Every structure is written in structure tokens, then in C-alpha cells.
Amino acid sequence: HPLLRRLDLNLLLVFDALYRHRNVGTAASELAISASAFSHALGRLRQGLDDELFLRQGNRMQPTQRAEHLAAAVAAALRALGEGLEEWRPFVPGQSQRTFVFAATDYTAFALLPPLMNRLQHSAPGVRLRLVNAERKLSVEALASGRIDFALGYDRLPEGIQAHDWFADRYVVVARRDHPRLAGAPTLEGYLAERHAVVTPWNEDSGVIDRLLARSGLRREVAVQLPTVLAALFLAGSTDFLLTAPRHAARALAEAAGLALYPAPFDIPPYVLRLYSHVQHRDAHAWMIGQLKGLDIS
Amino acid sequence: PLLRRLDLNLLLVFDALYRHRNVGTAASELAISASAFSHALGRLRQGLDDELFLRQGNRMQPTQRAEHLAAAVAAALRALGEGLEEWRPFVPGQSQRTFVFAATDYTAFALLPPLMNRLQHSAPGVRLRLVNAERKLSVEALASGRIDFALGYDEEHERLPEGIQAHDWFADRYVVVARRDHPRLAGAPTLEGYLAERHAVVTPWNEDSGVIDRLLARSGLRREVAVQLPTVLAALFLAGSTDFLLTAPRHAARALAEAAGLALYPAPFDIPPYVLRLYSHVQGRDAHAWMIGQLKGLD
Amino acid sequence: PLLRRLDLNLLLVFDALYRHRNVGTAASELAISASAFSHALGRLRQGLDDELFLRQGNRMQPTQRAEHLAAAVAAALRALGEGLEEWRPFVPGQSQRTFVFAATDYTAFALLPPLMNRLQHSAPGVRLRLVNAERKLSVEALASGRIDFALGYDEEHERLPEGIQAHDWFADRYVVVARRDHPRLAGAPTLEGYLAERHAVVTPWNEDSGVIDRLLARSGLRREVAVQLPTVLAALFLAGSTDFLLTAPRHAARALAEAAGLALYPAPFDIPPYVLRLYSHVQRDAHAWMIGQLKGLD
Amino acid sequence: HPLLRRLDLNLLLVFDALYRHRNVGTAASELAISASAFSHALGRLRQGLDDELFLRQGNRMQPTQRAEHLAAAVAAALRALGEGLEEWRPFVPGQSQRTFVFAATDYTAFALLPPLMNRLQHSAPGVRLRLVNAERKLSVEALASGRIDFALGYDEEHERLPEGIQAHDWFADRYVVVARRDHPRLAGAPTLEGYLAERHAVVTPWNEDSGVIDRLLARSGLRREVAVQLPTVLAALFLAGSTDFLLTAPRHAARALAEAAGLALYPAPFDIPPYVLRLYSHVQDAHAWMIGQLKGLDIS
């Protein structure tokens, strides 16, 4: 191309940050340059490309058509380059300003981050994490393209994917403290007589407990499905609904939500929280996997 | 081709009779006389050119063809009935309907406990399904009726899109949350003290910045971000195990202050108060007016 | 109740209007007059207290409520349809069945003329509907029974997926085609002659490359592609008015050789002769009858 | 990114040119920079990557093993950029290498490609075309994106254009009734009832439940008995030559196959508007040229 030779490729970072942030202030912050230098860089990109690229519309900077068409190409270019350069020298935790991106849910964020970041805030003070909601627990392509470094969840692995287990726990049945129909653990029949709250973190049709019960031809009555366990626990606290939840979350919220926790009157295998990654993926990744060790999760 | 010749109303007659195996009881379910039923039966026998059910006294036994047909009919009638549920008159105390809400963990935490404390007794068969959506307000999903309502609040007086209506239900403010014993906080943070810490940031739709970063940028300010995540309730547990500051809804912060070990402070800069709203598409229903009315019971 | 007050026959009117978006042709499919159809639609509008379809055309556009009912009604009629088809033994001289084939222009060209020449006499009531499908074999479609059969062949001795069977019905080979007066071919091209020209390529499922491209690559060769298009018969006329070479099935090329003005040559490289197959889900006498019909065909 | 933020990315074109040429004089002339400018840039990149990157043997520049890992990443990145920036390449017909993507049917591919490519093979010899079977005639979505440059078809009577879609006419033609040359019941052109007493082949290019003629005929209270629907006119014309079925088809296509498939062509015994085939595009250089190409194009 004759354009690559004329265009200051450093302006591509400006273009990419603004397309993602739609905001000059937060894009300039990501880039660690001043609002003024950012605005000047945008004027140059406008001149280099003979296009406005982004016009302010209230809050937001909105891309033109030419910008919209260029955006995936630039982000693909920067991904190839960044991966390229990461491989280049070994990972240095004390100096790293890298962001690790995890696909996660509220429960994995809750389980993982507080003890991980209690460490990282000291041993790696410039490393950042970014957790995102994903439409699936485990997208290989996202892991393969390096858009996402890790995925979190639990429970045979797709190809190119490995896991590192980092927490193991069990499910309990949760009800509010003064539930009218509990004077100990529900029986199977008593559990199946109530209405249930169910956590579906990827907007699945049934919960993990529903599918478990199906193996035995059992079905519960569902009052509410929601993606978030911590909110589910406050819901159980203010209603007569039962929630079958990770015990680690339920204990953390038992006093705040006013909850009682009970064994389930059917078997539920203990679960193990795991970190998924792509086999392709590397010093930064190994360092993070190694951090998941010294980790006492409560 | 043979479906168009068949009086499809007669399939209700087949279906009741296959289920009941007796004419008086099947007729009773359909609310017609036994005579009426017997005549419909004779019509169906002609329409399918089969005896369909063999009579022994008053026992009614399916022929081989009837048996083979029965699952097809039950499944068809199920599909029809499911598709017409949307036409069923809404009555609160009897409805078995689901309301689908696009939400975040925070609006789920804010809405569900009180709404369902009441709806569980007032409308014991109504279900709610909350989904993470890829943005706060997709007009198409709401126009579809693929989701019924969305929850969130208006940022910096954004204009409601094309044919969205909203109704306010909860006013609150943001506070600055730190772990209760923070190394550098002898008291409320100053602006400089706030900007000297790293921050936890809630990005409920995977945005690259938080609502507070964007507010700060409008004054030429920025904060050092250590973690972004979509969930406020986990974020408060994060603030409680680290030196990270979290600038969060006071309603969530108070409910977890003791569980997460937090201190709560006023922001050392101006933050508009926020109002949680319920958003919908302008295209009617008794169900929708009713849920809009239930969001008018505080906490 | 729900079903109980509604005249369920009115759901066929609904279904036909939803598919035809045209009162006249929807009425025709149902073998009723326009007025009956309109009175029936009036009864549905009442029964459902909607308007269901909006005359914005001379075409009929669904409302939002019709929009939802539509898939339910479709599913109901499909279920009934299947059960009723099992009902009586298949009688070819009496049948009014539509057989639905996934096909390409080439397989339609190859199959339909000799098949229908016979069926128009031996099964005057039987109708065929050929559809362009997303790929040759999206087996879900064959199981759903959305499609009775699919035509095509198996490339590179490929195995074909589980629960799918197939029956040979045409053997043919590939041939290199050029306009008769091409300035540099009046006999078979050498490989270098072949690879010096530009090429038309048939990609029937909008694929990235042609079967001959994939073949050539296996030997580390590349041809220069001028035109990709999904239609063999149109590609033949393209080759007749240009200096492009097309590598295409001989049966099609012979048919168009005079009309398009083409010369036909063997390829300077090895192309395995292909077989046109009939594909079906193992899962029906209607199906076995069709299988028996291609069977004994020329 | 955050190592990208640190690197002068423009130095990566010097890296990439030197990796391909393995000689500083030709890498430099590829980049249109002086020798000393090149050598300074290579010096900066060696400081930026803290590596030699290339060792000199004569004039031969041999990449360190490090440099080897990085070149593929640079090449991929530069390839993605160049492709997104093609949009900015000045359009020259005689030299252009672009691929135009059209949404089409077998009929419109047949009508357009022979004369279009008859010309373009000479006038724009590196220009390529890609025709795809789209799920409908006119998907404004695909046009906007520019995943598809153009769409081909005709307006049904006289259809209103969606917003952001413009159309340009390229061929006026009419429909005719086609039968096998020796049909047992046609002593000449069919009458209306003669036509309605046959079974019919019908072309439904987007898999619709009716033909454009069925729509038309129903508007006079008339219905035909359909034996076969298929999306291809050209296969349909052969079907008509091997059966008693009638087909109501574009004249341009039926004339091209009359001999090959053994057909007779007759005027329709009812009124059918002429059709006008058109080129559709979204309101948003290459596109302007292609639009002008069809303008004077001889189809017949």
C-alpha cells in the first residue's frame, strides 16, 4: 500500500482507542497521553485519512462509515502486533502494565478477585484485569484469537483448550432465615413443593440444578431465573423461594441477606472452579496460572 | 394436501378421546353433550377413514392408526396452545406468565427482593427471567417482545431512543467505597487522595470505561484503573480485600458494608444522583400496564 | 381455550398468508376462492382481535402478534403433516405430495428433465420443490424433514456424516471448457497453458474456492480466478463470451456446447470422476419410492 | 497495548521491508527513503527491540532467530491494515485488482456476466467478480456493510426502493411461455385456458412460495397447477424441453436455450409487464465506475 508509507502508524492506536471508548477523555487516559495531544492526534488522523472519522453526538463520539469499515482491520492489526511483541521479552510482573482479560460470571469474579488482587496489588502494581460477560462459558475462538486470555467457570475439554483448577466447593440449599416451612433441611418432597430461584449465567433455558434433577426425571418449579448468584442470594432472603447455590457465596452473604443454609436432599457432586486457556498461549499466561496457586480462597 | 381437507377442530375430539378412553368424560372436558361428541367422532371417523377407537361396553380402544397418530396430535395441539398463550387475558392472581427483563446484577439486586417479596403472594404463578443483554437498551429486542422490559438508568440525560418509554422507580446516589481499614485513609478521601489510589470499575455491558471515568473526563480528570468487571456486588467484595477504591451505588454498598468489610464515604467531586428506570417499547398489554404499576412499591 | 373457542381451520389461512404475503396465491394454495379467504381472514382478525397483516404492498406484512403465532402454527402443521403422511400407504398414482430437494443449478439440470419426463406420467399428482440451501448437507434439515432429500456428490472420497445415507444416480467427469475460437486453444491445454489463462469458477454454496481450486492446491498449484459464481449453466455462457476457462461437469458442458459456442477438453491434470448422489436421513415408503425412481433412471 | 504504545510502529515497515528484501538498498528504495535514513531507522528499531535483528554478510542481511518469530506477526498485521485501507487506494480500472461482489440469481448472472466480462477481460484485466446466492433480492444490511457491493434483480410493479438503496436500470425484456417444441396439445400459441390446462414449472429464485407470474395471475382470479418450483431459470428451460410442462420465463434466456433444450416460445395469453433488470446499491470511486460500466453495456 502507498497509504501505509505516508500514514503515521502510531495514529492507529488513537483510532482504535477512540473507536472502543467513543470518548476522547477515557481514550486519552488509556493511551496515557493528554487530552490535547489526543485531540491533536485525531486532527492528524482526520488529515491522513481525509475523513472526520468520529463526530461528537452528546456524550459519545460516533464513527463515520469509513471509520466503521476500518475498525475491525485496525483491531486485527493491533492484535497481531501486540501478540508479536508480548512473545518478544519475558514477562516482568513488577513493571508490567498488561491487562488480562477473563470471561467470567459474578460468582467467579467474587471467588477469584478478592484474594487474587489482594496479592497482585503489591507484587504486580501495574497489571490490570478486565472481566467481561460472554455469551458462553467457553468460546475457543475468543481464546484462540487472544481477545480473551482466560475463561472462568467449572466442569471433556474442546481442542486446543486446557484447564487449571483453582477452587473446589459444593452446593447447598438456601432459604431465608424464618422461612414458614423449614425447621431443618428440606426433604426431597419439601424441596420440590417450593418455588425456586435459579442462576443461569449465560441465559441458558434451565439451571445446572435443573439439568441434574432431570437425570432422575425430577423437575422443580421455577419462580425466577437470573444470571447473578449474589443478587439471587438477596432474592432468597426476601422471599419464600429456595436457591441452590455455591456454599462459598451463600456463607459470605448469610448474615447480609438473612439466610439459612441446608444440605440438599439429593446428591450434588462437588464442583471445581477452573481457569480455561488456549494451548497456543507464553510468559504472561504462565505467570497468571502460577498466581492462581498461592491462593487461599476463604 | 390432506390437512386442508380435514376439519382440524375435530382433532380436539380425537385428543380428548385418546387421553380419556371414554366418550362421556372426553365430552365433559370439551363441554359438549355426549350426542354432540358422538356426532363429531363419526365425522372424524369419516375424515380419517378409520374406526379410530373400538368400543367394548363404554371402554374405547384406539386402532393401530389412531395410536400412531396420537403423539403428532398432542404435539401439534401443544404447539398451538403455546403460541396462543400471548392472547390469554392477563389476570394477576391467575397468570402463569413470564416477564423477561434485560438487567445487570445491580438492578437485579435492587428490584427482585422487594418486587418478588410481594409478587410471590399477589401473583403466585408469574415468573421473571432476567438476562444479561449486550447493551442496556436494544430497541429491537423490546419491539420483538423478545424481552419485555429493560432496567438501567439514564446517563447525562441521554435521549430515549426511537419509541422507548421509561418509568422511574428508584432514586439513589454514588458513594466511594474502600476497605474498612484502608492504609491511607485516616478519613474521607480528598480528590487528590482518591486520584492517588487505584480503582475498581463496574462495566456492566463490557464497556472500556466506567460511568465514573466518563464523568471525571468531563472535568479533565482521570483515575488509575486496576480492575473492570460487570458486577457491582462482586466489586464490593473486591474493594474489601484490596486498597482499591470503588465508586458505587450507595444502596448496594450499604447492604454489603458489613459482609465485605467496607467503609463508605461521599465522593470528593460532584456526581449526579441516578434514577433507576424501567424501559419498554411503546407497542397495549394488560400485563405491561400491570408490571409498570407494581414498580411503585418502594424500599 | 385458546384452542377451544377458535376455529382451528383459520390457522391454515393464517399460515398460508404468512408464507405467501399475498391473498390470491395464499387462497390458491388452499384451493378456496378469494372471498372465502378474505371472509376467513376477517374471522381470524376477529377471533384473535388483531389485524394480523398490514396491507403496505399489494403484499401483506405481518403485525407483531402474527409474527409470534407464525412459528407456533408452522410447527403444529409440520407435526400434523408428518403423522398424517404415515397414515395411509404411499400410492404413486394417487399421491399429491411435494418432495423437497436441496439442490444446485447443476443437480436440478441433471435430475429434473429425465425424472419429470417419467413422473409427469407415472405420478401425475407428485410435485417437486427445489431449494437453494446453505451447504450441500445441513443434516439437521434432512432430520427436521424440512427437506426430503439433497443432491450433490462427495468430494475427495469423503466419508459423509452419521445417520445420513446416500444413493448413486449419475456418474460423470470434469472437462475444461473454452469458447470455440479462443485465441490460444484449439485442442486440450497443457498444464502451463491451463495455468496461463484466467478462470471462471463455480462455488455453489458461496464458498471461498472451487472444488478444482482445492484439488489443484493438493499439488501446490494455483490458478488465476477471474469470476466466482454459484451457477454452472450461467458459467458456461460466461466461458463462451470470454477467454476464460471453466472446469465443469461434461454432461452440462455438452448440453450448452452449441448454445454457448464452446469447445470441450480433458484437463491436463487428474480429476477423479465424480458421482451425483441422493442424500437422505435414515430417520418411509414415499422416500423409498423416490430412491427407486432415480435408481432406474437414465 | 501497552508495548505497542511504546514502539514507534512506523519502524515496523522498515523491519518488514528488510525481512522480505534481506538487503538494505532494495528495502530502502521500496520505502522511498535514502540509505542513511534507512540505516538510522534500522538503528532505532534495534534500540526499540533491544536486538540486532539482522546481521550483515556482504550486502546480505540475515535475521536473528528472534526477528524470525516477529516477521510473521508484522506481515499479518500489515496485511490486515492494507486490506482495510484498500478503501483509500485510488481506483484505476486498467490496473485495479479488486473483487466486486454481487448478489445475484442464475438468470441475472447469465444476463450480465457474458457481455460485462467480454469487455472487462480487456479493459480491466485484474478486476475480479464474485457472485453469491443471497437469501433475498435486496438486503440493505449487506449493501451498507459493503460485504456486497451490488445486487441484481427487477422491481415487481413498480416496487418502492428501501431507504439508502439506489437502483440503475440495465436491461428491459419481456416474459414468454415456453413448451417443448413438440408439445402434445399445442397446435400453436396457447390460449388462456390451454395454458391453464397444463402443469407448470415455476422459478422461485429466493425460495418463495409462489412465482412472480402467480402473483400476477391471481390478480385476475387465475391460478395455475404447479408441478415443480426451482430457483434456476436455465435448468427450468431444460425441464420444459423434456416434459409437457409450461414455463413462463424471460425471453432473453428462453431464446438462448431454445435449440439446446428443444423449445417453442410463444406470447403469453395474458398481460405481463416488461421487466427491467437493475443494479442496486447503497447510497454508502470503484462503485461509481462499475455503475457507469453497465450504463452503455450491450446485453442483447
Side-chain angles (χ1 to χ4, degrees):
Chain A
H1 220 118
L3 185 56
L4 290 194
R5 198 34 262 309
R6 193 162 72 257
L7 175 87
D8 177 1
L9 303 185
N10 298 296
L11 296 173
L12 297 175
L13 301 177
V14 179
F15 176 92
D16 177 81
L18 192 49
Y19 182 89
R20 283 185 288 106
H21 284 259
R22 306 305 176 74
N23 187 287
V24 300
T26 67
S29 171
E30 194 186 290
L31 281 202
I33 56 176
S34 94
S36 164
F38 191 93
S39 159
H40 194 268
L42 175 59
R44 299 169 43 234
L45 201 41
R46 285 162 165 171
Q47 290 171 135
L49 293 181
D50 199 43
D51 194 79
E52 301 104 289
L53 302 171
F54 295 96
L55 300 168
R56 175 175 298 284
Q57 293 311 145
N59 305 337
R60 279 207 23 140
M61 301 293 291
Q62 191 69 30
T64 63
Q65 248 261 110
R66 257 170 154 193
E68 199 30 56
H69 145 85
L70 183 60
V74 177
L78 306 175
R79 200 149 43 239
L81 291 185
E83 295 189 25
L85 301 165
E86 269 172 41
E87 283 195 276
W88 188 263
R89 303 215 255 168
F91 191 69
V92 172
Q95 294 300 318
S96 191
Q97 304 287 311
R98 201 210 201 271
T99 298
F100 295 81
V101 185
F102 291 74
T105 59
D106 83 323
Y107 178 49
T108 57
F110 160 84
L112 179 61
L113 291 180
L116 180 62
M117 299 312 308
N118 177 93
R119 174 142 91 202
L120 290 197
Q121 60 180 344
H122 304 286
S123 74
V127 161
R128 299 162 91 268
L129 267 67
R130 174 180 164 72
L131 270 61
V132 305
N133 290 329
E135 62 133 79
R136 236 133 54 114
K137 170 182 88 210
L138 223 198
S139 157
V140 194
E141 309 104 292
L143 295 170
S145 50
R147 267 167 185 80
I148 285 161
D149 293 279
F150 305 103
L152 302 179
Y154 69 87
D155 234 279
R156 198 178 81 233
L157 305 155
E159 318 109 82
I161 280 117
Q162 48 187 31
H164 285 77
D165 289 337
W166 56 272
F167 185 58
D169 196 31
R170 58 185 194 276
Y171 280 88
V172 292
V173 176
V174 183
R176 73 168 176 110
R177 252 146 202 201
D178 287 321
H179 189 290
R181 297 176 294 269
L182 291 185
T187 68
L188 184 58
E189 176 233 284
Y191 180 89
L192 302 164
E194 300 298 334
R195 299 180 81 206
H196 296 262
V198 0
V199 180
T200 51
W202 295 284
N203 310 329
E204 308 99 308
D205 280 343
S206 69
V208 48
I209 299 312
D210 300 302
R211 306 188 270 285
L212 178 60
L213 287 170
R215 292 189 259 285
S216 308
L218 294 175
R219 183 198 141 257
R220 63 198 172 157
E221 214 194 325
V222 176
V224 177
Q225 317 176 106
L226 74 167
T228 156
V229 71
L230 309 165
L233 288 156
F234 285 97
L235 172 58
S238 275
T239 61
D240 298 343
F241 305 156
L242 294 200
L243 171 75
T244 313
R247 192 176 86 95
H248 178 65
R251 310 184 76 185
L253 277 58
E255 297 311 314
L259 307 178
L261 329 191
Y262 304 96
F266 53 94
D267 177 58
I268 311 164
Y271 71 82
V272 68
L273 295 190
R274 61 182 41 184
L275 183 96
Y276 307 86
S277 57
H278 201 268
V279 295
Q280 283 318 121
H281 286 48
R282 262 136 144 162
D283 227 276
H285 281 234
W287 170 79
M288 181 63 78
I289 280 161
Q291 291 298 300
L292 263 62
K293 281 32 168 42
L295 233 49
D296 207 299
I297 287 69
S298 291
Chain B
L2 59 144
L3 209 64
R4 63 228 242 285
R5 270 296 247 190
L6 210 239
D7 183 352
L8 304 173
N9 299 124
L10 264 355
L11 288 190
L12 292 176
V13 165
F14 181 90
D15 188 63
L17 223 200
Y18 189 88
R19 274 195 285 99
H20 292 280
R21 322 295 249 266
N22 170 268
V23 162
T25 174
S28 209
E29 172 180 322
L30 313 185
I32 63 189
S33 59
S35 188
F37 190 95
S38 187
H39 290 291
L41 182 53
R43 292 186 54 218
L44 182 64
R45 284 180 174 144
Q46 297 306 324
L48 298 177
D49 186 32
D50 195 80
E51 283 307 299
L52 299 178
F53 292 91
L54 271 9
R55 185 180 63 91
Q56 181 181 301
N58 74 16
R59 299 181 174 276
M60 289 305 290
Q61 257 289 124
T63 62
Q64 219 176 256
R65 295 210 286 188
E67 223 123 26
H68 289 253
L69 190 67
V73 179
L77 292 167
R78 178 188 326 112
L80 291 194
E82 281 173 357
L84 295 159
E85 275 292 354
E86 216 195 289
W87 275 267
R88 148 130 47 217
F90 182 71
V91 315
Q94 237 70 33
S95 187
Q96 303 300 293
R97 71 164 294 184
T98 306
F99 294 80
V100 188
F101 284 79
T104 58
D105 76 324
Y106 174 59
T107 46
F109 163 78
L111 190 57
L112 290 185
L115 177 72
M116 303 306 300
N117 172 259
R118 172 212 286 164
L119 294 201
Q120 67 176 332
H121 298 308
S122 87
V126 160
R127 293 167 83 251
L128 265 71
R129 174 186 192 243
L130 267 66
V131 297
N132 292 312
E134 84 167 37
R135 75 200 301 206
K136 174 177 71 224
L137 226 58
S138 181
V139 195
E140 8 176 308
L142 295 156
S144 291
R146 189 190 103 206
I147 98 223
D148 293 286
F149 291 99
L151 306 170
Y153 65 75
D154 298 325
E155 192 183 334
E156 293 300 324
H157 311 82
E158 310 160 67
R159 199 53 68 179
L160 286 165
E162 263 313 5
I164 306 305
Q165 91 210 208
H167 292 79
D168 288 3
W169 57 278
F170 183 63
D172 189 35
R173 63 189 204 267
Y174 279 66
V175 293
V176 168
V177 174
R179 65 177 305 140
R180 174 70 194 89
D181 302 322
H182 185 282
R184 291 171 293 275
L185 292 179
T190 59
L191 179 60
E192 174 141 6
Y194 180 89
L195 300 176
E197 290 311 317
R198 299 173 76 207
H199 297 256
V201 175
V202 176
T203 50
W205 296 280
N206 304 333
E207 47 298 59
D208 291 74
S209 66
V211 64
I212 308 294
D213 297 300
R214 289 188 296 271
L215 171 69
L216 295 170
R218 284 185 330 92
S219 307
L221 300 173
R222 47 234 226 190
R223 64 192 179 162
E224 184 176 7
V225 173
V227 180
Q228 290 172 153
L229 61 178
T231 153
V232 200
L233 297 189
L236 284 163
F237 277 104
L238 173 63
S241 295
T242 61
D243 304 340
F244 305 159
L245 299 191
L246 169 66
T247 304
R250 177 187 187 278
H251 188 49
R254 290 182 22 237
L256 283 54
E258 180 79 28
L262 305 176
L264 307 207
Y265 301 106
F269 50 91
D270 294 335
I271 308 163
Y274 70 86
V275 193
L276 293 195
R277 325 184 80 190
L278 171 82
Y279 308 89
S280 47
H281 197 280
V282 68
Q283 70 189 2
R285 296 118 227 285
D286 284 45
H288 282 222
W290 176 83
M291 188 60 79
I292 291 147
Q294 299 304 116
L295 311 210
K296 187 198 282 92
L298 221 177
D299 97 343
Chain C
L2 294 252
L3 291 346
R4 220 222 253 161
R5 225 87 294 270
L6 183 74
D7 173 5
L8 265 34
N9 295 299
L10 290 174
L11 298 180
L12 285 182
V13 173
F14 187 78
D15 183 83
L17 230 200
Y18 191 85
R19 295 175 286 98
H20 288 260
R21 310 281 179 91
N22 180 275
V23 169
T25 54
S28 178
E29 179 191 282
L30 287 185
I32 52 168
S33 72
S35 302
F37 190 92
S38 299
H39 181 199
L41 175 64
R43 296 196 296 286
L44 199 45
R45 282 175 166 153
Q46 195 106 245
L48 287 195
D49 200 48
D50 198 47
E51 192 59 31
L52 299 154
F53 305 78
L54 285 169
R55 196 163 266 276
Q56 269 150 39
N58 210 13
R59 276 184 169 265
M60 300 283 314
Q61 165 95 194
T63 76
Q64 312 84 32
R65 268 167 133 200
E67 195 47 57
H68 183 232
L69 189 49
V73 182
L77 299 183
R78 197 161 308 116
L80 291 176
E82 302 206 86
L84 283 190
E85 270 173 6
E86 196 207 350
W87 204 243
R88 261 133 149 208
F90 176 82
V91 184
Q94 202 187 162
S95 198
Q96 288 190 114
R97 215 213 200 244
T98 301
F99 282 89
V100 169
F101 287 74
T104 60
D105 85 313
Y106 172 55
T107 55
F109 152 87
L111 175 68
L112 286 184
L115 179 72
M116 296 309 107
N117 176 75
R118 166 204 283 191
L119 295 195
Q120 75 178 334
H121 302 305
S122 73
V126 158
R127 296 172 42 158
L128 268 70
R129 170 179 190 149
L130 269 56
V131 304
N132 276 321
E134 276 202 25
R135 29 232 221 196
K136 46 325 280 287
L137 214 47
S138 269
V139 29
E140 189 192 342
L142 285 171
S144 321
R146 283 300 232 82
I147 298 169
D148 296 282
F149 291 99
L151 301 158
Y153 63 93
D154 290 311
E155 176 188 340
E156 184 78 14
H157 63 117
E158 69 187 297
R159 277 164 144 279
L160 55 57
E162 316 194 29
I164 286 304
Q165 69 187 309
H167 286 89
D168 303 349
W169 61 266
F170 193 55
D172 197 17
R173 58 191 214 270
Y174 278 87
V175 109
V176 177
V177 168
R179 76 186 180 101
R180 266 150 185 187
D181 294 336
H182 185 288
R184 71 215 141 237
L185 279 85
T190 62
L191 180 75
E192 160 198 16
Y194 184 95
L195 295 159
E197 296 302 333
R198 300 178 70 204
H199 297 261
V201 337
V202 178
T203 48
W205 293 284
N206 310 340
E207 46 277 65
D208 354 38
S209 69
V211 52
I212 264 82
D213 298 302
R214 295 187 296 268
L215 168 44
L216 272 181
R218 289 180 201 114
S219 299
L221 304 159
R222 204 113 112 184
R223 61 190 180 162
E224 179 182 3
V225 182
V227 191
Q228 263 173 355
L229 74 166
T231 154
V232 192
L233 294 192
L236 289 157
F237 281 96
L238 171 57
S241 296
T242 63
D243 305 339
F244 306 157
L245 307 194
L246 167 67
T247 309
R250 201 186 97 113
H251 187 55
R254 307 250 297 160
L256 280 48
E258 282 302 321
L262 307 166
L264 274 56
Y265 310 110
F269 49 94
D270 288 333
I271 311 163
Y274 72 81
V275 304
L276 287 183
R277 302 236 275 184
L278 188 71
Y279 300 86
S280 45
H281 187 34
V282 202
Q283 217 75 41
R284 184 143 270 259
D285 354 275
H287 281 198
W289 175 78
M290 190 50 89
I291 299 169
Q293 290 300 116
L294 285 62
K295 254 201 210 124
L297 205 60
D298 267 74
Chain D
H1 255 97
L3 342 94
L4 289 192
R5 170 83 229 294
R6 205 88 220 273
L7 190 62
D8 186 347
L9 302 181
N10 299 118
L11 296 176
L12 290 173
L13 303 164
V14 171
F15 184 81
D16 182 77
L18 216 204
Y19 192 85
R20 291 185 284 98
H21 292 278
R22 270 103 181 290
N23 172 265
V24 302
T26 49
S29 71
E30 192 194 305
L31 302 170
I33 67 186
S34 80
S36 92
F38 196 84
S39 180
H40 172 43
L42 169 58
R44 297 177 49 201
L45 196 49
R46 292 174 160 147
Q47 294 308 315
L49 292 173
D50 187 37
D51 189 87
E52 289 312 326
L53 301 180
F54 304 83
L55 314 163
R56 182 165 122 322
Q57 283 178 71
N59 66 28
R60 149 145 256 118
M61 300 290 294
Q62 187 60 34
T64 60
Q65 21 309 130
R66 315 288 310 290
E68 228 76 67
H69 311 339
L70 181 59
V74 181
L78 289 189
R79 186 178 58 244
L81 276 186
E83 296 173 342
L85 287 180
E86 283 307 303
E87 223 319 82
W88 280 262
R89 190 190 292 287
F91 187 67
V92 320
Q95 313 292 334
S96 178
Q97 301 295 301
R98 70 176 278 151
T99 301
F100 295 82
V101 180
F102 288 74
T105 59
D106 89 315
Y107 177 58
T108 53
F110 158 86
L112 203 226
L113 289 190
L116 208 215
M117 303 306 296
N118 180 67
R119 177 197 295 180
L120 299 194
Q121 71 185 331
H122 295 300
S123 72
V127 155
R128 289 123 211 176
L129 266 70
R130 203 231 211 288
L131 269 65
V132 299
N133 286 326
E135 305 253 337
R136 53 204 274 149
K137 178 154 61 95
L138 214 172
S139 152
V140 49
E141 337 168 12
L143 298 178
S145 347
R147 223 179 341 232
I148 281 161
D149 298 289
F150 296 102
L152 306 179
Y154 71 85
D155 303 321
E156 195 179 334
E157 78 165 36
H158 301 225
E159 276 160 354
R160 179 179 92 348
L161 289 183
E163 218 207 300
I165 301 330
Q166 61 189 359
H168 287 92
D169 301 333
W170 59 278
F171 187 51
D173 194 36
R174 54 185 207 271
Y175 278 70
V176 292
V177 175
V178 164
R180 63 144 66 234
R181 190 167 282 120
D182 298 327
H183 185 285
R185 289 166 298 271
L186 303 185
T191 58
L192 195 50
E193 289 192 22
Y195 178 91
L196 301 168
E198 297 301 324
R199 298 171 81 213
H200 290 263
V202 172
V203 175
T204 48
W206 294 284
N207 300 324
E208 55 277 64
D209 278 349
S210 75
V212 51
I213 309 293
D214 291 307
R215 256 159 265 129
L216 181 187
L217 278 173
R219 269 186 267 117
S220 299
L222 318 167
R223 58 147 303 158
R224 59 189 177 165
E225 300 300 305
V226 170
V228 185
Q229 287 168 150
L230 63 171
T232 336
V233 192
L234 298 181
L237 283 158
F238 286 97
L239 167 65
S242 287
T243 61
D244 301 337
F245 307 159
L246 301 187
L247 164 73
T248 314
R251 188 189 181 266
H252 188 59
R255 291 179 109 274
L257 286 188
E259 271 286 337
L263 310 173
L265 277 56
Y266 299 110
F270 47 97
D271 298 330
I272 311 162
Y275 67 91
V276 178
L277 293 188
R278 37 218 302 173
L279 175 70
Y280 308 93
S281 56
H282 202 285
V283 186
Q284 212 197 9
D285 250 28
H287 278 225
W289 173 83
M290 181 62 77
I291 285 162
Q293 283 306 289
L294 275 58
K295 260 153 186 159
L297 192 65
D298 168 38
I299 309 300
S300 317

